[PDB]
Design a protein around this ligand. Sequence first.
Ligand SMILES: [Mg+2]
Length: 229
Amino acid sequence: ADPGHHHHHHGGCPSQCSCSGTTVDCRSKRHASVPAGIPTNAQILYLHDNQITKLEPGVFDSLINLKELYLGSNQLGALPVGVFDSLTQLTVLDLGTNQLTVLPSAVFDRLVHLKELFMCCNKLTELPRGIERLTHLTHLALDQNQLKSIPHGAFDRLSSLTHAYLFGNPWDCECRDIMYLRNWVADHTSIAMRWDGKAVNDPDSAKCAGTNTPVRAVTEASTSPSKCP
Ligand SMILES: [Mg+2]
């Protein structure tokens, strides 16, 4: 797939990247921004393990054939409105290990066919809503954030989920609103995963803040509405 030259691309291959077929690999090369001149036939784009602190609006608009986008292990503190809107063929998106605190409300809306969404190891304090409408998701990773609860009904349209990673969040099990997540895990133990170089089925991966007991085992009697924020 790498022909040993860069003649297949009108703009050549971006500096400090490698190009192989429709794969553009810019990993681990101290990039502080997305490199210019990424080939528009690109299907897989590796931008992970760099020092990207921000994305310019529109930076990906030309990459209409992109299937997989890896932005993990950068220093993203925010995302621009609409930054993924052109990527309507995208099936894998990795935003893990950044510094994201909030996301634009509609940031995932045009990724109607997304299959795998990885957002571990950020600073998220609430579920990005409308992950709710990503009905083709098989993989959802929210582990090691600061999530306290899941809005009632948030996962109910995700009928293709096979792998959910929720480990390492301070789930607020004293608050009676936890019961949606409690019941959802108990109903979906088969898809409760933790990662150890492979997917491990572990229904106790989601645990309560403080007590570290399994979220799925919470009793409604132990909860209270007045312990909610
Ligand atoms: Mg040429």
